Amino acid sequence: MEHVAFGSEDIENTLAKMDDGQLDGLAFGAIQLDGDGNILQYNAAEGDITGRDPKQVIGKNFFKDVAPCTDSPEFYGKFKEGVASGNLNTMFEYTFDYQMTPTKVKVHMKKALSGDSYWVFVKRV
Numbered sequence: 001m002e003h004v005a006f007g008s009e010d011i012e013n014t015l016a017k018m019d020d021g022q023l024d025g026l027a028f029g030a031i032q033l034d035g036d037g038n039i040l041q042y043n044a045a046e047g048d049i050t051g052r053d054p055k056q057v058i059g060k061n062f063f064k065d066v067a068p069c070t071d072s073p074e075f076y077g078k079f080k081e082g083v084a085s086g087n088l089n090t091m092f093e094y095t096f097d098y099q100m101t102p103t104k105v106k107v108h109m110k111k112a113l114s115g116d117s118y119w120v121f122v123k124r125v
Ligand SMILES: *C(=O)/C=C/c1ccc(O)cc1
Pocket: 031, 046, 050, 052, 066, 067, 068, 069, 070, 095, 096, 097, 098
């Protein structure tokens, strides 16, 4: 695989500019969003957790279209506050339940190093 742990302190440096192939080698789900919530990257581990096909969801809006169960103050609200502030680093558990068996996960959202994009990392709990 790639040798990176979920929740690592410098994860934004390690994954900076990472190509889609390399991202598919992580042990955990990884999604890169723009500030509106459009999906830029979506790795294989995430697709295994959620059932989504990665190439099919890239370009869709995560909160509007893919993941309406996250369109809430507890997930999207945290995301949008962090985009607005230009700073985000939060970890919380959540349940994904849209057109799927409900699945409890740990989520880590963190602003990417450069530019203005945002990671959503996911693992099972
Ligand atoms: C709730 O609608 C969650 C859905 C979801 C979460 C994460 C994904 O990668 C895809 C769908």
